[PDB]
Design a binder for this molecule. Sequence first.
Ligand SMILES: CNC(=O)c1c(-c2ccc(O)cc2)oc2ccc(O)c(CN3CCCCC3)c12
Length: 269
Amino acid sequence: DGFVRTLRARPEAGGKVPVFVFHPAGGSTVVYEPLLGRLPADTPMYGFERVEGSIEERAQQYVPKLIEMQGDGPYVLVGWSLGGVLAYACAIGLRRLGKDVRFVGLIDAVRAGEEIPQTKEEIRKRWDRYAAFAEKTFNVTIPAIPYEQLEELDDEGQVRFVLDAVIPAGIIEHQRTSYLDNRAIDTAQIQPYDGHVTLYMADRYHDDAIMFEPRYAVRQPDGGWGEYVSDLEVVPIGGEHIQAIDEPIIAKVGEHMSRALGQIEADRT
Ligand SMILES: CNC(=O)c1c(-c2ccc(O)cc2)oc2ccc(O)c(CN3CCCCC3)c12
């Protein structure tokens, strides 16, 4: 299927408006199966899996596919983790092309409480933190970090440089894509969007997330989306980021989202 996974196929003709879901960091759209079970019967669902590039470059790949599949609209775009940002970026692209986007659902796609700087000083502090965790984890001494060579490299190049030093192909492939998908969240440059966004908000990021990047230890009440989205609804769901996508918490998301879908179906009926 390329990068589109069919979770529930739309009928040959007619039917309900499909929900387009976007993969999480380091994972696939199979994670949306619990959600799908909490959505109305015969709600079609398609998942957009990983593609390469910056967020904008990824949306430039998704948007033509969205249009091929759904045309003028209506568009319902949903994502947890990185998927939320991808969904949001696609919403901007679709709106810019005159399409009708009716719903953007961010499932705990929460920004760091303080903006993560994209600076050399930050690149050094980041790699120093990693090196220190490796020292403790692997009972090793890491020599001086070749900062100068690292600083000049993008995220992709940084991991290749690192993967020269150090393994089964599946693990390198899984670690590489997880790291890069997570950095993609970190460095996302949010643009403003004038349509409705629903943010399902958990209480906090899980411990591993925070150990990796302590700025995710703090969340703003709007999840960092308020300056960019004037039409913003927050649906608190509690719990941690990791749990937001699974039962039982997904039942709450599903109930709320089902109501939104019902109104959309009513509005076209
Ligand atoms: C739990 N580890 C992670 O979350 C991160 C990984 C990673 C690497 C390998 C793997 O197998 C699984 C994950 O690489 C990252 C890079 C930057 C970063 O800021 C983070 C933190 N992350 C927290 C959620 C909001 C987005 C940022 C991570």
